[PDB]
Amino acid sequence: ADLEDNMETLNDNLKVIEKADNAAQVKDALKKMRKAALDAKKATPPKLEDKSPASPEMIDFRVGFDELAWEIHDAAHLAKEGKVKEAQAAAEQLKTTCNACHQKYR
Amino acid sequence: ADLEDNMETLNDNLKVIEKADNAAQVKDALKKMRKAALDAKKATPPKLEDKSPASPEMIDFRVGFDELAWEIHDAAHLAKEGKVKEAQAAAEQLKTTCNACHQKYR
Amino acid sequence: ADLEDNMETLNDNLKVIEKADNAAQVKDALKKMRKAALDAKKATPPKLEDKSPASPEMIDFRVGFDELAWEIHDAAHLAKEGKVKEAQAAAEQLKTTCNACHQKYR
Numbered sequence: 390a391d392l393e394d395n396m397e398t399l400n401d402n403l404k405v406i407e408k409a410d411n412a413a414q415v416k417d418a419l420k421k422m423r424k425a426a427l428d429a430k431k432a433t434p435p436k437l438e439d440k441s442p443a444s445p446e447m448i449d450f451r452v453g454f455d456e457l458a459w460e461i462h463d464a465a466h467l468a469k470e471g472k473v474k475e476a477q478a479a480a481e482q483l484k485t486t487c488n489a490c491h492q493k494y495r
Numbered sequence: 496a497d498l499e500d501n502m503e504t505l506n507d508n509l510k511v512i513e514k515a516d517n518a519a520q521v522k523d524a525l526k527k528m529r530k531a532a533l534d535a536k537k538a539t540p541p542k543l544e545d546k547s548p549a550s551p552e553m554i555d556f557r558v559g560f561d562e563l564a565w566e567i568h569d570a571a572h573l574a575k576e577g578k579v580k581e582a583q584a585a586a587e588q589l590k591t592t593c594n595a596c597h598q599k600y601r
Numbered sequence: 602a603d604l605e606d607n608m609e610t611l612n613d614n615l616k617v618i619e620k621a622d623n624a625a626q627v628k629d630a631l632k633k634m635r636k637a638a639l640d641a642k643k644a645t646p647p648k649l650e651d652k653s654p655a656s657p658e659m660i661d662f663r664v665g666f667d668e669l670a671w672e673i674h675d676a677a678h679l680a681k682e683g684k685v686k687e688a689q690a691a692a693e694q695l696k697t698t699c700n701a702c703h704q705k706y707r
C-alpha cells in the first residue's frame with residue numbers, strides 16, 4: 390500500500406486500541422499496525438524524494454519503522470500477558486515515536 | 496550464507512514443522528527459519544542485479560524478509576504458548592509471504 | 602546517538618545483566634540494548650565511510666543489528682518467562698554476534 394494509506398491504518402488502529410474492551414481486540418489492532426509499519430518502510434516520503442535512496446535520511450526513515458514495529462510488539466506482549474490497560478497505555482505512548490519521525494520527515 | 500542456501504533452510508524447516516510432534520521441535524525450526532530470513536536480507540537476487548542497491552525493488556526485497564521474520568516470530572509465540580497445531584497452521588500460512596516475494600523477484 | 606555511544610550502551614548493559622538479581626533488571630537492560638542496536642543501525646562506521654551507502658558491506662552492517670535485536674529479544678523472552686539464569690546465559694552468548702560484526706567492520 391502507499392505510504393499515506395499505511396499512516397491511516399496506524400492512526401485508525403490507535404483509536405481502536407483506545408476504545409478496546411479486551412486483549413483480542415488490542416492484539417488484532419497492533420498486528421495491523423505492525424504490518425502497516427513494515428509496509429511503510431518500502432516508501433519514499435515526499436520530503437526525501439530529492440535524497441539518495443540510502444542517504445542517512447532514508448536510513449533513519451526506514452529504521453524508524455523498525456523501532457515502531459518493535460515498540461508495537463512490546464505493546465502486543467503486554468496484551469498477550471493479559472495486561473490490557475498497560476497495553477493501551479503503551480499504545481498511547483507510541484505517539485512519541487510517531488511524532489519523532491514526523492518532526493523530521495513529514 | 497548464499498541466498499540459495501537460506502531458501503533451502505526455509506523450505507526444509509517448513510516441512511520439519513509440518514511433521515513435528517511437539518512445541519520444542521516447532522520452536523527450533525522457526526528459530527532456524529528466522530536466522531535464514533535475516534541472512535537472506537544480505538543478498539542481491541539475480542533478477543535485481545541490474546538495479547541500484549537501494550532501488551525500490553531492493554528495499555521491497557529486503558523488507559520482505561523483515562515481514563517474514565515477524566510472521567515467523569508470531570508462529571513461534573503460538574508455539575511458546577503451547578498451541579502447537581496453531582503454530583503449525585501459522586507456519587503453513589507463511590507460504591503466502593514466500594509466494595508474494597517469489598512472484599515479484601524469483 | 603553516536604555509534605560509539607550506542608556501543609557503550611550495549612557494553613554497559615551486558616555487565617548490568619551479568620550482575621542482575623531478578624528478571625525486571627534483566628528485562629530493563631535488554632530493552633535498552635535493543636534500542637541502542639536499532640539506533641546504531643542509522644550510523645556509518647569509520648571503516649565503511651568510503652563504501653556506497655547500500656554496498657553489500659553497509660547492508661551486512663545494518664542487518665547485523667537486526668540479528669542482534671532479534672537475539673536480544675529471544676533473551677528477553679527467557680526473562681519474561683521467569684528463566685532468569687537462562688536469560689543471563691543467553692545475554693552472555695550475544696558476544697558471538699558482537700564479535701562477528703566487530704571482526705568485519707570495527
Ligand code: HEC
Pocket residue numbers: 392393396397399400403434435449450451452453454457483484486487488490491494495
Ligand atoms: C517515520 C519513520 C514515520 C513514523 C514512525 C510514523 N509516521 Fe506518520 N508519516 C510519516 C510521513 C513521512 C508522513 C507524510 C506522508 C505523505 O505522503 O504526506 C506521515 C503521515 C502521517 C499521517 C497523514 C497521512 C496523509 O494523509 O498524508 C498520519 C495520520 C500519520 N502519519 C500517523 C502516524 C501514526 C499514528 C504513527 C505512529 C503510531 C506514525 N504516523 C508513525 C512518517 C512516519
Ligand code: HEC
Pocket residue numbers: 498499502503505506509540541555556557558559560563589590592593594596597600601
Ligand atoms: C523475498 C523477500 C523472498 C522471500 C520472503 C522468500 N523467498 Fe524464496 N527466494 C527468493 C528469491 C529471489 C529466490 C531465487 C534465488 C536464486 O538465486 O535463484 C528464492 C528461491 C527460493 C527457493 C529455491 C532456491 C534455489 O535453489 O534457487 C526455495 C526452495 C525458496 N525460495 C523457498 C522459500 C520459502 C519456503 C519461503 C517462505 C518460508 C521463501 N522462500 C521466502 C526470495 C524470497
Ligand code: HEC
Pocket residue numbers: 604605606608609611612615646647661662663664665666669695696698699700702703706707
Ligand atoms: C555490527 C553489526 C556491530 C554489532 C552487532 C556490534 N558492534 Fe560494537 N561496534 C561496531 C563498530 C563498527 C564499532 C566501531 C565504531 C565505534 O563505535 O567506535 C563498534 C565499537 C564498539 C565498542 C567501542 C566503542 C568506542 O568507544 O569506540 C564497544 C565497547 C562495542 N562495540 C560493544 C559491542 C557489544 C557489547 C556488542 C554486542 C552486544 C556490539 N558491540 C555489537 C559494530 C558492531
Ligand SMILES: [Cl-]
Pocket residue numbers: 419420423461462465
Ligand atoms: Cl506484534
Ligand SMILES: [Cl-]
Pocket residue numbers: none
Ligand atoms: Cl499529513
Ligand SMILES: [Cl-]
Pocket residue numbers: 443549655
Ligand atoms: Cl538500505
Ligand SMILES: [Cl-]
Pocket residue numbers: 451557663
Ligand atoms: Cl532494514
Ligand SMILES: [Cl-]
Pocket residue numbers: 525526529567568571
Ligand atoms: Cl522467533
Ligand SMILES: [Cl-]
Pocket residue numbers: none
Ligand atoms: Cl528456484
Ligand SMILES: [Cl-]
Pocket residue numbers: 631632635673674677
Ligand atoms: Cl526485547
Ligand SMILES: [Cu+2]
Pocket residue numbers: 462466568572674678
Ligand atoms: Cu516477541
